[PDB]
Symmetry: D2
Subunit: 115 residues, 4 copies
Amino acid sequence: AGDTTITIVGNLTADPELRFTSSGAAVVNFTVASTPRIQSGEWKDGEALFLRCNIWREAAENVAESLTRGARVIVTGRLKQRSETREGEKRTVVEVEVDEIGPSLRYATAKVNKA
Amino acid sequence: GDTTITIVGNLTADPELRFTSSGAAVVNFTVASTPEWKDGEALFLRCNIWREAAENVAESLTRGARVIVTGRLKQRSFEREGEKRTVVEVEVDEIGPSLRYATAKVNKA
Amino acid sequence: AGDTTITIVGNLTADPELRFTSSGAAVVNFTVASTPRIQSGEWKDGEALFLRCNIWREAAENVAESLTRGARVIVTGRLKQRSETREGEKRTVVEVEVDEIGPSLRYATAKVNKA
Amino acid sequence: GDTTITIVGNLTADPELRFTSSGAAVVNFTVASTPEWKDGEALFLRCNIWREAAENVAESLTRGARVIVTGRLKQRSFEREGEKRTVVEVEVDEIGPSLRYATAKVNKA
């Protein structure tokens, strides 16, 4: 495909927002806040990066069932650009189409249940 | 200037879990990543993780668990001509079970 | 640092724009257009991703000396969010702070001259 | 589902350049990546690239050139107990000389 991929580690800013399309397909959107650590090297919170993420179907439902606001997650996916409404100003935004997502075990444990 | 990597695959075994001299937790595991499209060629990366993270892994994961792993790729060579031997391994920065085919109960320990 | 890194392959949409700050530091900005290939698998141009990139100092000058509009490049760097002026609407944008950049040798040759 | 990687480092030697039975260009090279911070631990990744790209590499690059390489990580093991031997290598998707410490004259061949 030649897609631009990314791995992002961070915290969900809110509970995953679950919605179903007309066809019945689940769609979930959420924002990952990634805070780098940056006389100050790795011992001061840097400016956060906020990336909106989209995930679909069974993986979306898995996420809606498992994750909540503030959860630390590891996300891999592909960078996508999405484009107004009632203002005229036609703006583009970069988002992540999620390939895999999981809760990080850095500060937490998890009980996994396979589909 | 580390070479970083993300790998998605399955734990080949239940994670090890040991404690060092200093009383520090260490966990070793191997991720088998196999790229419908039949079955592609597998990649088995040896991984290690330390401390609380290592304890969380050992309490949470089991053989076969699908995981997302990110970290730094390291390499060693064992030699003067004796047939060079080289190995790589991943010093894990973050690891979690993928929710692609599963759900999980998450508890901030 | 815990930064979110990326590798992007694509073409410069224009000649690199070279500028110097008050201190005399070179700053170069450019946009990478990355076009994935996506009955149609890998044999149809997908929607392009356009990422604005920032690079500084000697590396910026190296780029201003070497690259032009349309050049195929490989870029690694870190994703950064940058925030109005005279409209009120306060908007964020995602950009790349470049760590390494080079012309791709996929369709081109290069004569490299070390600093 | 390939495991991809990006590595930045220096060519350990002038790139090889050969032609296969079919008349297809192949190039093999090794990237040495060494992570002021003294000198960190080196990573040497064996790489291969094919066809026009391979010809471009061979005409453009020389030993020591700083390169940015992206591609797919592959692995093989040579065994029944004979002492397992494992190697990895990168099937290169894209490669270019870094402009971090250099300029370059670029010609669309």
